[PDB]
Amino acid sequence: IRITLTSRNVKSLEKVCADLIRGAKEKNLKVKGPVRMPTKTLRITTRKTPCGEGSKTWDRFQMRIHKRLIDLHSPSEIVKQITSISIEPGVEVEVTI
Amino acid sequence: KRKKKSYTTPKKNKHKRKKVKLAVLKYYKVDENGKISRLRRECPSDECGAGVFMASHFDRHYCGKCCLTYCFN
Amino acid sequence: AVQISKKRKFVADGIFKAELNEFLTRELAEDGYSGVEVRVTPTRTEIIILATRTQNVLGEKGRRIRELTAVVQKRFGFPEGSVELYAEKVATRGLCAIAQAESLRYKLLGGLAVRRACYGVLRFIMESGAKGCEVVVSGKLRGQRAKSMKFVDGLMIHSGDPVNY
Amino acid sequence: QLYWSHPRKFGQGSRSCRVCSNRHGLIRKYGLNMCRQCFRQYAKDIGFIKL
Amino acid sequence: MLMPKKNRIAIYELLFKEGVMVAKKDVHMPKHPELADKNVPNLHVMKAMQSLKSRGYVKEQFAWRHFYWYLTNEGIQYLRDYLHLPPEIVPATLRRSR
RNA sequence: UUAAAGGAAUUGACGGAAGGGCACCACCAGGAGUGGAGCCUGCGGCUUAAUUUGACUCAACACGGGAAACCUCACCCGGCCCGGACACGGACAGGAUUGACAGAUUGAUAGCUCUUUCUCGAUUCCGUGGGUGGUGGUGCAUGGCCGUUCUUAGUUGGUGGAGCGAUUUGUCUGGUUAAUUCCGAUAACGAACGAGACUCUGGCAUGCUAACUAGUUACGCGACCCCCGAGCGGUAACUUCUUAGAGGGACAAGUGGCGUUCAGCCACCCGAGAUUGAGCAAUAACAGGUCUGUGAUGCCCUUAGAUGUCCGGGGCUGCACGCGCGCUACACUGACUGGCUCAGCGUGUGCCUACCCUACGCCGGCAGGCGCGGGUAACCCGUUGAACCCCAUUCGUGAUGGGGAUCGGGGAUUGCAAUUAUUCCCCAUGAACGAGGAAUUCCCAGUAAGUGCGGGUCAUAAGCUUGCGUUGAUUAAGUCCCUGCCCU
Ligand SMILES: [Mg+2]
Ligand SMILES: [Mg+2]
Ligand SMILES: [Mg+2]
Ligand SMILES: [Mg+2]
Ligand SMILES: [Mg+2]
Ligand SMILES: [Mg+2]
Ligand SMILES: [Mg+2]
Ligand SMILES: [Mg+2]
Ligand SMILES: [Mg+2]
Ligand SMILES: [Mg+2]
Ligand SMILES: [Mg+2]
Ligand SMILES: [Mg+2]
Ligand SMILES: [Mg+2]
Ligand SMILES: [Mg+2]
Ligand SMILES: [Mg+2]
Ligand SMILES: [Mg+2]
Ligand SMILES: [Mg+2]
Ligand SMILES: [Mg+2]
Ligand SMILES: [Mg+2]
Ligand SMILES: [Mg+2]
Ligand SMILES: [Mg+2]
Ligand SMILES: [Mg+2]
Ligand SMILES: [Mg+2]
Ligand SMILES: [Zn+2]
């Protein structure tokens, strides 16, 4: 049974990961590590101008999608208890049994 | 810009479609002062000819609502 | 029964944020509008309007906030009361530059000329804890040519990364 | 009455933008529909930074 | 020029039930997507709501493709004219508040 | 006849005046080239019923990510629709407002119109006021954005002197740096915006934190050969290799010299690095461009036979010429064939409204078709088995087998339709081009150049552009002579 935590920024990602570690390592659960995924980047290049004057000056917009996975083998009643967390809004939670 | 769309006029005048009829339309006929004689043709049962009659033509027949086409020699 | 990728759901949520925020700043231009914060909970999607004059958001009899909740629900597809709105009061009026420009707009509309309006907003922002402010008003300002009227007071950082926050 | 011909299911005319129904400039396929002139102003709202 | 008669009573009944209407810019010429709630796509909705936005009954807001129609208290005072036909029922906007 | 003319003096602005500096969009010593030929694609001019349009030295000319079969399309040719909101008012049809079958005309089975006559139900049609739309004009009315000045280092206030005062010193003789960055002398002091500092990528490392959506050592299942415990591949622990969190690590610090105590330059070691590349980026302008990005907009024009909006075509491509950015060659350091061998960014499905990425097996010579499977993704393509390169054969200085322009025939793919343009494959036709005058563009180390891949355009789709990888130099670390700019 795995849980995917995918956040917008790495600071809130590490804060909710530290909260999950602090709320999980006291129970009788063999907690697997927050497996680091490679950072995804959506690169968009923009002309910067509505009309064609000047040099070829381009905006380069990027995001940094950070993804983490955790593994917790347990009955399904424990997963719903762990899931109830007062969480940062920039964090997305998925479960997979 | 300088080229102005002017009326070259090979086609002088045309008018819109104006629906004109007579004053009143009597589809029925009085027999024996109370019995109605049907003159025009009805439409067959395809949920169209419950109150819709056909129009006279040289060789065709036409329904009003659902536009049913009929032809007979 | 449908799903989209992580690389597209993020930009769809970001376009949702910008769409909702700028629709609310285009229809809630009357009161003091600051911004929105959307919490994603699959039982109840929470939308918090941070605003200055929250009395207009609360409405007369709890009218306008429920009406705009219906406005969100009848397009964005969340039946059964999934979308729930909450208004927050911004007591620091001189903190939000969006609210300051939104209040400067209604003073520039009905009379209340540009010199008096600019010094009146600069005195308020400088009194409300801010270390510096700059108001740039440009356009047709008493003449055919576009005279740029700029006013700067206090301290202002222009270059580098921490300008954005 | 012939109201809708020329079905416009492909190409440049089928791409109608999300911002102002602009169709002259191109519209990207990233899960995104912008006009490339408003994308600069609205990237800081939808979540793109310059770096 | 008229639609079937169910169209007008359906769109004003939906406005009676909710008070919020939304349509998009796409007037029938490239593509024909129908309304997400009813049968008539965009143009009959605009023809029904232009008589309300022109007389000052229902306010108009535009967002990026979409016409949102907004309810006024004087809007309800002139929806009394529509309320001539059903019994007097206030929709779920002004009556109660949870 | 006029309410100014005039005199010192301050700050801008200007100069075709002087001095000092900076820049590889300036040069020296060089490299690649362009300008020469062919082709691709814009511009001017021609031609045309239309060949839409703006932009014209850097700061226009593969720019509007502008790669058009209709779409895009704003230009011509012909033809439908009102979405004419809303008020008063004309007929109000004793309730007749819009929709069409067959024939003619027209691409049309468009009731566009005509012959014909059924249907729809008080929302109509017309007029009088007003309203909407416009990729119509006006960027010299404008907002916003971008470019340029300027990627150069330049601007301002508080106290204090100098002057009656606007103002000036601060904000500078010299040295140094990429820098108004400091030391210094000092009528100046503490200081601000900017440059740095800020953020990201790249470079290091740990028995720190940890991973069956990423690997390693042993080990068993298990294929092969010598047969001599060995060797290469397929299917219980730890993060060294793949990825990412924090912290550390580099500061001119250690030494010697050059320097006024100095600010600072030069040579070496330790080190992975003696400092890499970007983003943001001061006051202030250009009367630079965008109303053709917007439901951002002022003014003017049209609004029912329409500059509104639909349908079918043509056009933007049209060539006696000139110019710019580019692609390919002019061969032997090379072309042909066969074998061998290595990547990294990033993208990919049932999407806020119509849609891919592709493994396998078969058929076909090929471009391609058919059936099935996986992937909403470190899972599948994919251990991206790329090009260049390495080895061997053929050619032998011939416009040759280099170059593949032009042109003929055939076959498949997407599209509803590619013909006065698709695209690809097969055969064939086989031009100029023998390293390019006058001039001109870019560049100081994983850099130029060779070479391929991904995205943007898309449905079929690059020679454009943005990023990524592979191979990978010769020259400088200097100056004010050419050009441009800054300061007194
Ligand atoms: Mg102006
Ligand atoms: Mg002016
Ligand atoms: Mg300005
Ligand atoms: Mg265009
Ligand atoms: Mg004088
Ligand atoms: Mg030059
Ligand atoms: Mg060219
Ligand atoms: Mg020409
Ligand atoms: Mg040109
Ligand atoms: Mg241009
Ligand atoms: Mg025109
Ligand atoms: Mg136009
Ligand atoms: Mg104008
Ligand atoms: Mg004095
Ligand atoms: Mg001075
Ligand atoms: Mg590794
Ligand atoms: Mg400036
Ligand atoms: Mg508007
Ligand atoms: Mg060329
Ligand atoms: Mg080429
Ligand atoms: Mg698509
Ligand atoms: Mg040919
Ligand atoms: Mg496409
Ligand atoms: Zn748009």
From Swiss-Prot, chain B:
Disulfide bonds: none
Domain of life: Eukaryota
Segments of this protein annotated with the region Disordered: 1-17
Localisation: Cytoplasm; Nucleus, Nucleolus
N6-acetyllysine carried by residues: 26, 35
Cross-link Glycyl lysine isopeptide (Lys-Gly) (interchain with G-Cter in ubiquitin), sequence positions: 29, 35
Zinc finger boundaries on the chain: C4-type: 43-66
Post-translational modification remark: Monoubiquitinated at Lys-29 and Lys-35 by RNF25 in response to ribosome collisions (ribosome stalling): ubiquitination promotes subsequent activation of RNF14, leading to EEF1A1 ubiquitination and degradation and rescue of stalled ribosomes. Deubiquitination at Lys-35 by USP16 is required for maturation of the 40S ribosomal complex.
Residue ranges of the TM segments: none
Quaternary assembly: Part of the 40S ribosomal subunit. Part of the small subunit (SSU) processome, composed of more than 70 proteins and the RNA chaperone small nucleolar RNA (snoRNA) U3.
Chain's role: Component of the 40S subunit of the ribosome. Part of the small subunit (SSU) processome, first precursor of the small eukaryotic ribosomal subunit. During the assembly of the SSU processome in the nucleolus, many ribosome biogenesis factors, an RNA chaperone and ribosomal proteins associate with the nascent pre-rRNA and work in concert to generate RNA folding, modifications, rearrangements and cleavage as well as targeted degradation of pre-ribosomal RNA by the RNA exosome.
Designated name of the protein: Small ribosomal subunit protein eS31
The organism of origin for this protein: Oryctolagus cuniculus
Lineage start: Eukaryota, Metazoa, Chordata, Craniata, Vertebrata
Gene symbol of the encoding locus: RPS27A
Residues shown, of full length: 79 to 151 of 156
Curated annotation (Swiss-Prot), chain D:
UniProt record, GO biological process: cytoplasmic translation
Molecular function terms from GO: structural constituent of ribosome; zinc ion binding
Residue list for modification N6-acetyllysine: 44
Cellular component, GO, one term: rough endoplasmic reticulum
Residue numbers carrying Omega-N-methylarginine: 8
UniProt cofactor note: Binds 1 zinc ion per subunit.
Keyword Cytoplasm: yes
InterPro entries per UniProt: Ribosomal_uS14 (IPR001209), Ribosomal_uS14_CS (IPR018271), RIbosomal_uS14_euk_arc (IPR039744), Ribosomal_uS14_sf (IPR043140)
Binding site for Zn(2+): 17, 20, 35, 38
Location, primary (coarse class): cytoplasm
Obligatory cofactor(s): Zn(2+)
Modified residues (Phosphoserine): 5
Subcellular location(s) of the protein: Cytoplasm, Cytosol; Cytoplasm; Rough endoplasmic reticulum
Gene3D superfamilies for the chain: 30s Ribosomal Protein S14, Chain N
Keyword annotations: Acetylation, Cytoplasm, Endoplasmic reticulum, Metal-binding, Methylation, Phosphoprotein, Ribonucleoprotein, Ribosomal protein, Zinc
Functional summary from the UniProt entry: Component of the small ribosomal subunit. The ribosome is a large ribonucleoprotein complex responsible for the synthesis of proteins in the cell.
NCBIfam families: PRK05766.1 (NF004424)
Subunit structure of this chain's protein: Component of the 40S small ribosomal subunit.
Recorded family membership: Belongs to the universal ribosomal protein uS14 family.
Protein name: Small ribosomal subunit protein uS14
Organism: Oryctolagus cuniculus
Gene name as annotated: RPS29
